[PDB]
Nucleic acid binder design. Structure first.
Length: 1129
DNA sequence: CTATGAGTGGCCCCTGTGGAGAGAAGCCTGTCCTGGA
DNA sequence: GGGGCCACTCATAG
RNA sequence: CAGGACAGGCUUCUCUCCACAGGUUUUAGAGCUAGAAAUAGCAAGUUAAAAUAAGGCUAGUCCGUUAUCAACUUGAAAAAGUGGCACCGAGUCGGUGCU
């Protein structure tokens, strides 16, 4: 008799519950054969348990690190390009300068050349350090002077500029002379008054520079400026111009009464284009007004930058840096004077102690600028003469460094201008610089487009670029080697969907006109109308649909029921009264793309042309695919023969985003084999059948369904891993699902390969059920109908939670891990009971108090970073990992705290003592993650290298993390690492104590009827003696397996101390005790007033000769190996 | 007399921002359709 | 949250 | 009862590519004076170079932290295969009967 049995499953983020029950809600138990070298040949176990595992993580970190690696590599490549350019002339003056540059990081003992890099002689080095305290001094001096300087200084300046070229946000050119806010505001007002003499603006008395440079929001600046302008509004034309000058996006529809919105934003690249067409609409006389607005905006954002006001040079940033340096020097002198004058004792603290947050700590230590201000602020409060210094502190301007985090707002055009000025001044003495000025400018301004991607030769699983040729990609010949249009199309396509019914065809663009026609006819197909004299609703004819679309859909961007009734039935068909069903208020789809094309091209018959279908659809596809404008113009240049410049540029501007859910070949590509119509043709005219898309794809009359069946290529059965990975969700739930399916497979294998009756458990859960059904039921009957021998049940946790709360079967997650198993068991029981109580309740209570539950910790091989990322200074300790091959850690410091890959057991002989005496040993040597490949290649050589000799190969036992060892008195420990252990034993409590603890913990939070609440409170009051029993049992369990003498003593003392506390507080504090006894690593926990630190087992010597256990994924099959007999002499 | 292991307790760990796209999922208003029961 | 490392102290064997 | 397309909104999340600002580490930026030295006073401090997971070959202006993995037999791996049942009890499972 194949016993009828049910399987219950609970899938969480960390756990997978499993349980097997009979037809009688009873859990069978079986005796299992045990392999190994031990004597315990067979053990009886229950068929219930749960699996715990570490939660999975997303791929975000890997992608971030890859991006960082590419950034670093490309920056170094640019530096190498500059060195290559300077290579010819550098050797003619200083051959070893480049060697000195890179070899700088080595100590003086290691350097092949002289220690001073810049000159190689200390005198010139000191002279350089004196004449130019900061690199900004050199930059400004080269910008302003006309003298011929040494090649090395120019090289240094150019390298500094390139390596920190700054951000690329704003396109176009920036005028550095555009910095005066007031003068440009006056010019804008003057131009407005000249062009609007009937409405002049009196800008006198308005401080434009203060308002526009204020650290307020753009709307606040606009409001403040307008409030000072009588008669003007932010909604007015001048208000919109100011908003644009602030960097907002005003709408110019109202001031020119245009039929179309004219929205301008200076950050958008459309400013030139939209300005051009706006002038084409309102007249070209308004060019200088927008020019003045642009100049004012430029002055604004360059005024927020560049604190310097009136100093005249081509390098304002260098002037700002020098000004800050001078202020820092003067303030430092004054501060030293004052501190020495009044508080000499703290002078040492301020200027000598590195560890404190004073000036010495701010400079030579790790104290940040905010920390330094925080430390110095109370001290300055105690002294006098620091009023302006206090103001500067409030301004984040006191003693400011040059390299600060606010530098993130520097446009690259400033560095470009400085480069251009330096090259202009010095190219007369340096012909090769003048010749390669173009190359230097390109290198400074070059940027890889976002749509191109990595420049690989196919050997990267991330690269998609298509090459025109096979030259080495250089910044000067990038455009001549890469098909930018094809690359962009590939970038778009690989992220697009595939059609469900036709997986071999791309889906159409969302705003494709053919798609819009399809949708409109699809909705019109199911529109019914009832007029006077009509007994039943009738479907609209094809000519009726065509007339309706031409009259309303092509003319109105939205058509409503009332509009249709007034415009077509009442006017065209002369039906005065009509009742329309299937559309309530308005029609859903619309011909927006048709309206846009009729607005741009301004030709209706050209759009109405059926033969231009290919050209029109190709134009729509081109507008959807590409976002860069040059590529769009490149593609549109084929169709320019039919359009003027205005139409082409307006077409150049229309972008469309989104995609449809269906393919063109499905709708209008496949023709009916009988009639020749496509789906669109049938929607246009289907006779009295009037079949919609759903009806057409399911009708057996046409061959479209036959093509659907044929086009279903027999996709090779997706592997369970791949099938789950293809689902929608985070990888963690995917891992949980995979482990659950493996658990189900093992449970099936256990029961003698007899299939179960019922499997008890959002679209992801639906996919899980689908996977289970597919793997379990594969039998097809004589009619090719799947014989569902197994029932799949979907139930929500709310039902089982109610089941628990109704029958006092409380769940306390803080006691142990059995709650997952009990929840799975109750899930299965409730599902079977509902779909299919004195006996049942007794059986359930018997099941709950059962002591043996299979709890298994999943064994894993840890991977990830080689070590921590913080780099530590050199120290005399062997635990420091070198950052590179030829860098002694005691000379340079480096990494620390590597992570163990996995542990291995080694039994061999090791020399010990100064006499070099061979000693037979038995210890654990853990492999670091960085060593994993080397060890896997040849363990023998690796073990020989670490002082282990006479290798005993057959004793190598793979010991991953959480490998379980068994010791005396049932005490269990898990191998946390190569040198640390965790708790391995679980505490079991009688169910009555769990119920009492739950009732006490929610004593004041009772959610039930008043009589039930009072009864529960009385029950809590009656059984106070349980607390002593609970404490005694905890002490006994800790004594037997935990060995926590001092911590237990402190716990006992605290319990005796707080024995007078209220019952709720006592229970709440006692609940915190299980952190000492819970599975996993010990953790510190708080008990009333005293905090108890974590007791950490750092000794792996006791388990060297214990019994090792290997366990199946469900823990039913197991093999036991004793370490004592292993490695015997 | 000093090197060597074995525990107690304490302290540490890379951060911030922008631009570009595609998809998915969940909720809501609603209309229509396919399949079986 | 959780494993590594280090200062400190102590017991032990050469 | 399940499934689907559309019209619109809202919200969140995932995945991929291109850039910036730092941080950390070592070296360079003659420390002076009195004192044998311990030490005491004095001066000064803002910056620069290189590296940022060891490295690898398929040598790319590429890849290197996602995912998967109890034990034994076969297989290079993928992958395939390998373990008796019924009854009475329960402090981590125990006992009885058949085979």
């Amino acid at each position: 008799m194949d016993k009828k049995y049910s399987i219950g499953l609970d899938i969480g983020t960390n756990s997978v519950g499993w349980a097997v029950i009979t037809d009688e809600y009873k859990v069978p138990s079986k005796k299992f054969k045990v392999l190994g070298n031990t004597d315990r040949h067979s053990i009886k176990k229950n068929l219930i348990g749960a699996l715990l595992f570490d939660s999975g993580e997303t791929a975000e970190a890997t992608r971030l690190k890859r991006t960082a690696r590419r950034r670093y590599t490309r920056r170094k490549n640019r530096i190498c390009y500059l060195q290559e350019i300077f290579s010819n002339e550098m050797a003619k003056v200083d051959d070893s300068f480049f060697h000195r540059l890179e070899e700088s990081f080595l100590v003086e003992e290691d350097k092949k050349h002289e220690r001073h890099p810049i000159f190689g002689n200390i005198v010139d080095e000191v002279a350089y350090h004196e004449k130019y305290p900061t690199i900004y001094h050199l930059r400004k001096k080269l910008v302003d002077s006309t003298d011929k300087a040494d090649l090395r200084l120019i090289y240094l300046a150019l390298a500094h500029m390139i390596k920190f070229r700054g951000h690329f946000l704003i396109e176009g050119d920036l005028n550095p002379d555009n910095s005066d806010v007031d003068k440009l505001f006056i010019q804008l007002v003057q131009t407005y008054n000249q062009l609007f003499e009937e409405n002049p603006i009196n800008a006198s008395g308005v401080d434009a520079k203060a308002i526009l440079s204020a650290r307020l929001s753009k709307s606040r600046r606009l409001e403040n400026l307008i409030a000072q302008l009588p008669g003007e509004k932010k909604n007015g034309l001048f208000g919109n111009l100011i908003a644009l000058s602030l960097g907002l996006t005003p709408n110019f529809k109202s001031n020119f009464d245009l039929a179309e919105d004219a929205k301008l934003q200076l950050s958008k690249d459309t400013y030139d284009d939209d300005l051009d067409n706006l002038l084409a609409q309102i007249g070209d006389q308004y060019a200088d007004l927008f020019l003045a607005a642009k100049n004012l905006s430029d002055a604004i954002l360059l005024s927020d930058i560049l604190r310097v006001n009136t100093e005249i040079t081509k390098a304002p940033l260098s002037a700002s840096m020098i000004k800050r340096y001078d202020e820092h020097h003067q303030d430092l002198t004054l501060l030293k004077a004052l501190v020495r004058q009044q508080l000499p004792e703290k002078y040492k603290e301020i200027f000598f102690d590195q560890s404190k947050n004073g000036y010495a700590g701010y400079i030579d230590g790790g104290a940040s600028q905010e920390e330094f201000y925080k430390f110095i602020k109370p001290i300055l409060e105690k002294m006098d003469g620091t009023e302006e210094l206090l103001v500067k502190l409030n301004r984040e301007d006191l003693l400011r460094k040059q390299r600060t985090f606010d530098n993130g707002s520097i446009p690259h055009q400033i560095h470009l201008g400085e480069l251009h000025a330096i090259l202009r001044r010095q190219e007369d003495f340096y012909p090769f610089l003048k010749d390669n000025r173009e190359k230097i400018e390109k290198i400074l301004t070059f940027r890889i487009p976002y749509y191109v991607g990595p420049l690989a030769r196919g050997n990267s699983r991330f690269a998609w670029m298509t090459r025109k040729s096979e030259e080495t990609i250089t910044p000067w010949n990038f455009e001549e080697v890469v098909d930018k249009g094809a690359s962009a199309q590939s970038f778009i396509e690989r992220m697009t969907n595939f059609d469900k019914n036709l997986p071999n065809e791309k889906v159409l663009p969302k705003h494709s006109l053919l798609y819009e026609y399809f949708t409109v006819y699809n909705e019109l197909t199911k529109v019914k109308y009832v007029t006077e004299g009509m007994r039943k609703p009738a479907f609209l004819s094809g000519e009726q649909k065509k007339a309706i679309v031409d009259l309303l859909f092509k003319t109105n961007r939205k058509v409503t029921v009332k509009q249709l009734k007034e415009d077509y039935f009442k006017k065209i068909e002369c039906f005065d009264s009509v009742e329309i069903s299937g559309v309530e208020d308005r029609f859903n789809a619309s011909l927006g793309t048709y309206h846009d094309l009729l607005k741009i091209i301004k030709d209706k018959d050209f759009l109405d042309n059926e033969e231009n279908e290919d050209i029109l659809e190709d134009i729509v596809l081109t507008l959807t695919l590409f976002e860069d404008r040059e590529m769009i113009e490149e593609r549109l240049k084929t169709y320019a023969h039919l359009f003027d410049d205005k139409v082409m540029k307006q077409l150049k501007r229309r972008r469309y985003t989104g995609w449809g859910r269906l393919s063109r070949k499905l709708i209008n590509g496949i023709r009916d084999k009988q009639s020749g119509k496509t789906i669109l043709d049938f929607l246009k005219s289907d006779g009295f059948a009037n079949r919609n898309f759903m009806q057409l794809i399911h009708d057996d009359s046409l061959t479209f369904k036959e093509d659907i069946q044929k086009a279903q290529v027999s996709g090779q059965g997706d592997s369970l891993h791949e099938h789950i990975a293809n689902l929608a969700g985070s990888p963690a739930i995917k891992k949980g699902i995979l482990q659950t399916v493996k658990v189900v497979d093992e449970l099936v294998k256990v029961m003698g390969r007899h299939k179960p009756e019922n499997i008890v458990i959002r679209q992801i859960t639906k996919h899980v059920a689908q996977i289970l059904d597919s793997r379990m039921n594969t039998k097809y009957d004589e009619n090719d109908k799947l014989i569902r021998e197994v029932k799949v049940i979907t139930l929500k946790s709310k039902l089982v939670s109610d089941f628990r709360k109704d029958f006092q079967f409380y769940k306390v997650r803080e006691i142990n891990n059995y709650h997952h198993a009990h929840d799975a068991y109750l899930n299965a029981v409730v599902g079977t009971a509902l779909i299919k109580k004195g006996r049942d309740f007794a059986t359930v209570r018997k099941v709950l108090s059962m002591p043996q539950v299979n709890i298994v910790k999943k064994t894993e091989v840890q991977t990830g970073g080689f070590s921590k990322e913080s780099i530590l200074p050199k120290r005399n300790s062997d635990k420091l990992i070198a950052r590179k091959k030829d860098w002694d850690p005691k000379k340079y410091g480096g990494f620390d705290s590597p992570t163990v890959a996995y542990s291995v057991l080694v039994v061999a002989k090791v020399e010990k003592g100064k006499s070099k005496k061979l000693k037979s040993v038995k210890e654990l040597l853990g492999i670091t993650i960085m060593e994993r490949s080397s060890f896997e290649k040849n363990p023998i050589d690796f073990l020989e290298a670490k002082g282990y000799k006479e290798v005993k190969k057959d004793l190598i036992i793979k010991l991953p993390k959480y490998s379980l060892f068994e010791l005396e008195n049932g005490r269990k420990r898990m191998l946390a690492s190569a040198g640390e252990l965790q708790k391995g034993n679980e505490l079991a409590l009688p169910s009555k104590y769990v119920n009492f603890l739950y009732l006490a913990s929610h004593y004041e939070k009772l959610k039930g009827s008043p009589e039930d609440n009072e009864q529960k409170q009385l029950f809590v009051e009656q059984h106070k003696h349980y607390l002593d029993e609970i404490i005694e049992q905890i002490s006994e369990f800790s004594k037997r397996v935990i060995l926590a003498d001092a911590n237990l003593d402190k716990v006992l003392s605290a319990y005796n101390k707080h024995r007078d506390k209220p019952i709720r507080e006592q229970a709440e504090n006692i609940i915190h005790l299980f952190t000492l006894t819970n599975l996993g690593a010990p953790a510190a926990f708080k008990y009333f007033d005293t905090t108890i630190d974590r007791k950490r087992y750092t000794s792996t010597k006791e388990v060297l000769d214990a019994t090792l256990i290997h366990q199946s994924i469900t823990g039913l099959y197991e093999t036991r190996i004793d370490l004592s007999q292993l490695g015997g002499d």
